[PDB]
Each structure stands twice: as C-alpha cells, then as structure tokens.
Design a protein around this nucleic acid. Structure first.
Ligand SMILES: O=P(O)(O)O[C@H]1[C@H](OP(=O)(O)O)[C@@H](OP(=O)(O)O)[C@H](OP(=O)(O)O)[C@@H](OP(=O)(O)O)[C@H]1OP(=O)(O)O
Ligand SMILES: [K+]
Ligand SMILES: [K+]
Ligand SMILES: [Mg+2]
Ligand SMILES: [Mg+2]
Ligand SMILES: [Zn+2]
Ligand SMILES: [Zn+2]
Ligand SMILES: [Zn+2]
Lengths: 252, 227, 100, 268
RNA sequence: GUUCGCGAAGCUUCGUGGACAUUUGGUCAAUUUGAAACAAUACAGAGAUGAUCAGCAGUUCCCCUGCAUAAGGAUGAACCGUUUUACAAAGAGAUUUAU
RNA sequence: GUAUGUCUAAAGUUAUGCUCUUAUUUACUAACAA
C-alpha cells in the first residue's frame, strides 16, 4: 500500500527542468516567463515524467498534518520534495475525498480556486458552477507519435492509464472523433487525473516508438461538455433526481 | 466605497471555534463570479490548520445567489447552488434556474443589480424555505480456473466503481462498456477467481427467459461494434 | 416651517461625519503617502469572530483588486414614478404648429 | 518653511513593516546591489509593458534591439518618468562603478576623486538627464560654475590640467536635485506603475485648452440654442427635428459671416 | 538550557519543586491546461471632396503612449448600416349583408 | 513609402437584340520604368 511506505522523490531538483521552454520566438520576456517577437509553431510538448503511483506514492509532511490537498507535481510525477512535501503524495480515495468534501465545491484537489466559466477550451481547472467528473481526452494521434493502432488497443491503453489514477464511472473511446470521455467516481479524482495525464504519453515500453515519446505532443486532457446523446442525458437526469432525493431527505 | 455590507460566511465552512481571528484585505481581489473588486476576507479555521479559507466571491454576488461567500453553497442548507435550484424547480414549480451571464461585461452588470435569482427568493425568507421543505417532504411520500470472466446483463446506469466494490465485498481488474455490456472482468489471480466463484443482476459465464436476453445483448453488441 | 436649528445641527453632524469619512477613504486609498496626513470587531452569526487588517508589503499594490473596469450601471428604478402635467390646449395648441 | 505635521518619514515607515530587514553593508556593496536591483526593476517594467525589443544595457543605456514597426515604435516611446529613472540610475551607476574600479585595484584614490568630480561636473555630458527633465540644466549650470570657481581656487600657483578632485559642492548640488525630484518621481513613476497594473482611468475628461477651446465653445452654444428652441417649441418635437434647427443656426452664422442677411421665409 | 529553592552522593556531582521563555508564514504553492503584447508571412494601404492638404471636436459597454486635467496616437480607432403604426378624418366609386 | 487595419499560424466534445473578332479614346490607378 501507499500508507505502508514513505513517498519517494519523483526527481531531484538537479534532474528538474528549467523555466525557459523552447525559445519560441526571438527574445525572452522577463515578467511573463514566456517567449516573444515570434509565435511561429505550436507551444505544447510531452511531459518528461509520469505518475508511476505504486513506485512513488506514500507518506509526506502532509500525511502527518492533515493537509487536505494533493501535490500537483505528484500528479505530474515531478515533485522534488518527496516525503518533505506539504501537499500529499497518493491517489485520491473515498476517505480523502470525504475529508475535503466541504472545500472541494469551491476549489480543486490541488488547492486552487475554480472559476465562473470553463476556459473556452474546457482546458484548465474546472468551473465551480458545474460539478463535472468527465475528462475529454484529445490529442491521442499526437500522444502516440502517429502510431496506427486499433480503436480497441487505444481504449484499452487509455483504460490502463486513467483507471490506475482513480475509480471509473465509465470510459468510452470514439473512433469517429478519435477521443475519450472518461467519467470518474469523484470530482477530486477527475481533477487529479486531468493534471496527472495532461501532456503525457499513451505509449509503452513494448511499443517501438518508446524513445520518441518526448518528441511528439502529449495527451490533451481537457474537461468534457455533456454529450448531446439523449441516451446518457436521461441517465444523468435520473442520477440528479436520485441525488436530490438524498439531500432533500437529509434536510429534515 | 464604505465597508457597508458585512461578509456572508456560513457555519460548517468556518469551523467550530468560539473565536477565530480572520483578516480583511479591502478591495482585495476580483471575485470568482462577476470580475469585480471586493473586500477579501480570509482565515485559518484553526490556528495550526494549514488551509486558509479566503472569501472567493463578492458580498453582492453572495446575496444575489443567497449563498456562503467561501463555500458557494446556500447559507441555509449548505448544498450546491445549482442543486438547490433544481430542488426548488422540482417542488412548487417546473422551472427555477439562476443563469450567470458568461460574458465578462454583462456579469459585472448582473452582479450590480440588487435582485435575487430564482432559488434565492425562496431560501431568503425562512418561512418560505420551511414551506418548500414541507412540500418536498409531502412529495417524497464449476471452476476451470480462468481468472478472466465475461459478464453480461449490465444495467445501463450502473458504474464500474459499484461493480468493483461489490466484487470486493464478495472477495483485481475490470473492463466494462455500457454500449455492449461485454463486461470483460479479469482477476489478479486464478485462485482469486476460484474464491469469487465459490463465494457466489448477476448473469455470469466463465469464458476465456435468457434467450431474449441474449438477443438484446446481441443487437446492442452489434451496434457497439459498428461504433 | 423653516428648519429647526437643532435639527440643522443634526443634519450637519450626520452629513459632515459622512463626508469626512468619505474623504478619508479617498485619501488613504490614493498612492501618494503625502496625503495620508490630512486624514481627519464583528460577528457572522450568533457565532463570534475577530476581524483584522494584515499590513502588507509597501511594494506590492495596496489594492490588488481595482483595475479601472468599465462597468455599465443597472438603473434600479424598481419603484415607478409619474410624469404628470395638467393641461389641454386645442385652439391655440393646433393653430400654433402651422406657425411653428 | 518645512511643514512639520508629516513626521512619518519614508524609511521609518518601511522600518515599521516586517518585509524589510536591516544590515550593515559596504557602501560599494550597496551601490552594486542597487545597480543590480535597479536594472532588474527597469527590465521587469519594460518586459511587463511587453516591449522586450528594448534591450537595457547593464550601463543603463537603453536602445532598441530590432528595427521597430511603427506600432511597436509608438508603444516603446517610454515617457519622462521611466527615462528619468534610468538617467538617475545611470548617474548612480557611473559613480558606483568608479568606486568599484578604485576598490577593484584599478585606480588610485586621487584618480577616483578626480573621476567622481568629472562625473558630477559632466552629468550633462555623461547622461542625458537634461533630455527628459530640462530644469536639470540649472543643476548642470551650477556644477559648471562650481568647477570654474573650484579650479581657479585650486589652480592658483598650480598650472592647468585635469587632476583636481574635490567633489563636495557639486555632490551637494546633485543631492539637492535628488531631494527636489524624489517627490516628482514618486508621483510620476507611481502613476506609471499604477497604469501598468490598474488600467488608465476611463473617466478621462479633457479640459479646455487653447487648442480645443473653439470646438467646445461652439458645441456648448449649439446645445444652449437647441435647449432654448425645445423650450419654445410647443409640440415637443423629436431630436431629428432639432437637427433641422441647429443646421439652420449654422447656416445663419455663415450668412452673418458673409454679411448676407439671413432671411429664411418659412420660420416662426 | 540559565537560574532560584530542596533531596541524595562527594565548596563539587546525580535526582527533585519552581521562575524565565511560551504560536512563524501563506490571497501565492516549481512548464503546457486560467490567460499580455506585439512579432513574421500574406493581403490592402489614410476624413471631408474632383484633386492635394492643417486640423479641433463629438458619441462609444474601444482603448494605447504619456506624470498627466499637456499632448499625441491617421483629425488615435469605430461612427457612413439599417430603416414602416400614437394612423386618423372626409368624400367618391364598386361588392356583400341586413332592414 | 507609409501610418493603420484585416489574415494565417493544427489537432477532431461522446445525438440518430445578342455572340463574336478586334483597333482607338478617355479616366483612374500604380514605390513599376523614365
Ligand atoms: O569652460 P567650459 O566650457 O566648461 O570648459 C572647461 C574649460 O575649458 P575651456 O576654457 O576650453 O572652455 C576648462 O579650461 P580652463 O578654463 O580651466 O583653462 C577645463 O578645465 P581644466 O583646464 O582644469 O581642464 C575644463 O576641462 P575638464 O572638464 O577636463 O576639467 C573644461 O570642461 P569641458 O572639458 O567639459 O569642456
Ligand atoms: K486628439
Ligand atoms: K477624435
Ligand atoms: Mg496625425
Ligand atoms: Mg494629417
Ligand atoms: Zn509533493
Ligand atoms: Zn461557508
Ligand atoms: Zn462578484
């Protein structure tokens, strides 16, 4: 278990990467940390690190404290503070979700405030106005360096990746749209994965494009608008009703 | 302007201490709703609690929604605003929404208006709240060691977490597609599979009016495959 | 009745207090520390709490919030008010427009 | 007469807070650190503005990197606040650098003294301070005068040459100039960084000036006339019917200008 | 750990009761996905009017540069589009209906 | 030649009387040549 052992360091701050990405332009902008005098070509790239959770997850300063938030850099798999980190280092569970359930309405499991609206992409941390648990998973074409895999193969690999990080409500790959819709058990979990597999690789050691994983462009894990499909809409409605019955009985 | 309105923070949120010491930065942030300066209040719930609680939204916004300024929940019932609006829509009415305008200028404008939104009109006056509650209440009343199964007859609404937890109770991996319902369950060992089977909407073969069920499965499966 | 002297003292006291406070607010608001020298607890339920103002670094902006937003005002004329003129001119009122 | 009520100094105020600490640092260290600090500040400001194409040199001599597009050029005309700040830092950077040189084993103390003196008497010639704030000519002139005075009390029996130091009175001049300007720059750069952070005020309203006096006058006039006519007019006519009125007025004005009588028949 | 009282070994040492001192900081957390802005390549290249020119205004839920209530951004930009009813009264002719 | 203004800068949001052929004018425009 995670609770059996202390959390290992993801990567030592020597191994950590600098804040000077890619020279996308002609000159560096000090107050922005971005580049400038040229926006030729796309910015995004593939994460060097990944949350290998059983090899990494463990105790922290936080697990002593009762810090209610998980380490963004743990999710990214690059936390340079291992056991000395205040933010936690393990997969969110019912106990921890339950623990922070008050605050998590307003903000993420990464302890950062949600907003009125989704960022037009549905790309950034979720809005407070929706309690979404469903991540859109674009850029699979890019995430596998143009590997002509089977849809079954794709969906299975996706399953392997996101099931590892959180309890699944459902997943469904769409051949016609080349993307995923990865509904989660909890919003905290959803948040965690959404960072934990942002800019990651779907590739594996068994695959031949393993050393070219860095060179492509990573998974585009964003948030999902609810489907137009009335097949699931009805289900959603039913769920809402059920939940409402719970709370309403709880009021008295 | 003058600090005329007081902050609108709820109890649960704020924590069970007789006296906390919070700080107020006036004109201290744009809110999370209406992009508009307001007096940001914040406090650690306990002295040694690491998480500060800062007042996300502005007081006008809070009043408007009739909510907490830190929780974003109704100050009465401590529940999500959308959810409470749904509840209100359900009892006594058919339609009660609280539409926030997603355009940066208009949101400000809306915030400025001293007018309660749909659900807020109910929950403000406690009498009406009580009435709503009572109305709601009224409304209420053979083991070959395969380690790998293929489960069928899966209710469309059921989630994988429910399944796996059920299995655990009766005790790993799992694959489900709600289109096909070809629940490609796989156990971490064959001995575990044996244990499970020996321990036994649970239609369960061990591949590696049931007829009509098979047909329904069939067509659905086919459709899934075409997708 | 021309207003009572005592009540004038009241009004003056109220409004003077108000405007002095407003001007103070205006002054301590502004970045010019020069104009800081012309400046003339709570409970959020039955539950009780101490409010404080933490002094911040005098480099960072004093009021991070304010950023000169354009904001349209809602009128908030919730109460209706008449516009109420008493006349009915026919002879001069119709003969005039031909001239006007 | 210095005003007495304001007995909360700047340093005192800063001391009161937590965010400052105090140390005993060598004056050269203070200087160098302040050049570094100043450089970081100005670069931060410039980059914040967006115009990364203006490269600050470490000697506070600003210049553009690329040839500037007209838009870019317009953007990059930094005002009399930022440039003035730069110039003061340039001044400081000079003398501090000279001290560094002295102390870095390069130059003798006499050489240092002469260097400092040279800097003070040639602030004009070493940093275009005058460019931005021209009243600094007074200061420059004063320094020149001092030099003229000093030298000819310093070179009575001694011949000509550059080797005089004695930088005191000029230094005094510069200190008093800084005293004068510290308020001005607090205001100026205050407003500047406020604009960088908060947007500029959108209640701009322009005053009258010699340049826009006439236009304002005439608009006020036509507003008055229009008002009067509406007051007069018993039907309560539309704004479009006021257009006819004011246009009529305009024509009348022109007619008057011509000395052609303005006798339109159909009017009341 | 200092010190002030006590006890147990030799003014020295081990144990005991005190006094002193007794709540830091965070609105933030390390790169993509919570927000800049130009830049480049391409395309056009500027208000009156025939043509060439100075402008100053105005409205704007547009701003930028500027210390700015100077001024300047092409007269800073956009304004040039769309456009039906407080709809009446009178007469004549034709059609229908009724008495 | 410019101000200025648009444009591009890549990842897939889960629903079933005429045609013709020419030659000439005039005008405007043209950082194209003289
Ligand atoms: O009068 P200014 O224009 O300020 O110039 C003076 C002046 O030179 P001129 O007389 O040629 O103008 C001084 O010369 P004297 O009158 O003293 O002969 C000379 O002083 P030194 O002779 O002591 O050199 C000084 O030069 P420096 O700055 O090297 O001391 C120089 O100032 P500029 O060099 O700035 O013109
Ligand atoms: K102008
Ligand atoms: K104008
Ligand atoms: Mg011009
Ligand atoms: Mg011009
Ligand atoms: Zn960590
Ligand atoms: Zn609350
Ligand atoms: Zn608000």
């Amino acid at each position: 278990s995670w609770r059996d052992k202390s959390a290992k360091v993801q990567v030592k701050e020597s191994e950590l990467p600098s804040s000077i990405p890619a020279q996308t332009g002609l000159t560096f902008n000090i107050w922005y940390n971005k580049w400038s005098q040229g926006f030729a070509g796309n910015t995004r790239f593939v994460s060097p690190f990944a949350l290998q959770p059983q090899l990494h997850s463990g105790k922290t300063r936080g697990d002593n404290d009762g810090q209610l938030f998980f380490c963004l850099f743990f999710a990214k798999g690059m936390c340079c503070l291992g056991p000395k980190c205040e933010y936690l280092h393990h997969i969110p569970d019912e106990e921890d979700i339950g623990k922070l359930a008050l605050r998590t309405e307003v903000l993420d499991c990464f302890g950062r405030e949600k907003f009125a609206d989704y960022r037009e992409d549905m790309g950034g941390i979720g809005s407070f106005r929706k309690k979404n648990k469903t991540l859109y998973v674009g850029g699979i074409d890019g995430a596998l360096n143009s590997k002509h895999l089977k849809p079954a193969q794709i969906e299975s690999r996706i399953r392997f990746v996101f099931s590892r990080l959180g309890d699944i409500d459902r997943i469904r790959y769409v051949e016609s749209k080349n993307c995923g819709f990865v509904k989660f058990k909890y919003q905290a979990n959803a948040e965690f994965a959404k960072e934990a597999m942002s800019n990651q690789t779907l590739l594996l050691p068994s695959d031949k494009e393993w050393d070219d994983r860095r060179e492509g462009t990573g998974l585009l894990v964003k948030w999902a608008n609810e489907d137009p499909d009335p097949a699931a809409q009805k289900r959603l409605q039913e769920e809402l009703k059920l939940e409402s019955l719970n709370m309403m009985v709880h009021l008295i | 302007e003058i600090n005329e309105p007081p902050p609108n923070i709820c109890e649960q949120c704020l924590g069970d201490e007789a006296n906390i010491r919070m700080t107020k930065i006036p004109q201290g942030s744009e809110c999370k709703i209406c992009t508009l300066p307001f007096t940001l209040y914040h406090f650690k719930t306990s002295k040694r609690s690491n998480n500060i609680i800062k007042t996300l939204i502005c007081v006008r916004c809070a009043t408007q929604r009739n909510i907490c300024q830190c929780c974003m929940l109704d100050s009465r019932w401590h529940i999500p605003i959308q959810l409470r609006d749904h509840l209100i829509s359900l009892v006594n009415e058919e339609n009660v929404m609280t539409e926030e305008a997603k355009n940066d200028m208009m949101k400000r404008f809306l915030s400025l208006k001293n007018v309660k939104l749909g659900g807020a009109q109910i929950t403000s006056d406690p009498s009406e709240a009580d009435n709503i509650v009572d109305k709601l209440k009224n409304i209420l009343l053979k083991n070959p060691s395969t380690k790998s199964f293929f489960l069928y007859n899966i209710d469309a609404s059921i989630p994988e977490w429910k399944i796996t937890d059920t299995v655990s109770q009766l005790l790993l991996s799992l694959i489900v597609n709600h289109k096909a319902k070809c629940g490609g369950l796989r156990f971490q060992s064959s001995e575990l599979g044996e244990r499970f089977v020996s321990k036994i909407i649970f239609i369960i073969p061990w591949s590696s009016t049931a007829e009509n069920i098979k047909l329904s499965l069939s067509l659905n499966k086919l459709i899934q495959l075409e997708l | 009745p021309l207003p009572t002297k005592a009540e004038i003292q009241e009004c003056t006291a109220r409004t003077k207090s108000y405007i002095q406070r407003l001007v103070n607010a205006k002054l301590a608001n502004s970045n010019n520390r020069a104009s800081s020298r012309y400046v003339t607890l709570l409970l959020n339920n039955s539950h009780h709490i101490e409010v404080v103002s933490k002094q911040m670094d005098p480099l960072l902006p004093r009021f991070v919030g304010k950023k000169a937003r354009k904001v349209v005002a809602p009128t908030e004329n919730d109460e209706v008010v008449p516009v109420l003129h008493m006349d009915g001119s026919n002879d001069r009122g119709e003969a005039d427009p031909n001239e006007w | 007469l210095p005003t007495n009520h304001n007995k909360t100094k700047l340093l005192k105020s800063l001391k009161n807070t937590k965010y400052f600490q105090q140390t005993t640092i060598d004056w050269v260290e203070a200087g160098l650190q302040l050049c570094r600090q100043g450089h970081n500040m100005l670069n931060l400001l410039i980059h914040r503005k967006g115009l990364t194409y203006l490269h600050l040199d470490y000697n506070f001599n600003l210049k553009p990197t690329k040839t500037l597009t007209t838009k870019e050029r317009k953007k990059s005309r930094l005002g009399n606040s930022f440039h003035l700040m730069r110039e003061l830092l340039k001044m400081m950077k000079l003398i501090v650098d000279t001290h560094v040189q002295f102390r870095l084993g390069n130059v003798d103390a006499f050489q240092l003294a002469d260097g400092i003196h040279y800097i003070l008497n040639h602030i004009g010639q070493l940093t275009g301070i005058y460019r931005y704030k021209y009243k600094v000519m007074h200061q420059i002139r004063a320094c020149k005068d001092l030099k003229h005075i000093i030298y000819y009390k310093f070179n009575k029996n001694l011949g000509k040459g550059p080797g005089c130091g004695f930088w005191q009175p000029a230094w005094r001049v510069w200190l008093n100039f800084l005293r004068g300007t510290i308020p001005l720059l607090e205001r100026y750069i205050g407003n500047l960084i406020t604009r960088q952070f908060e947007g500029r005020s959108n209640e701009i309203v322009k005053t009258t000036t010699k340049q826009r006096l006439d236009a304002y006058y005439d608009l006020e006039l036509r507003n008055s006339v229009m008002d009067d006519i509406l007051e007069m007019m018993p039907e309560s006519i539309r704004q479009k019917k006021a257009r006819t009125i004011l246009q009529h007025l305009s024509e009348a004005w022109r007619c008057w200008k011509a000395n052609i009588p303005w006798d339109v028949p159909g009017m009341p």
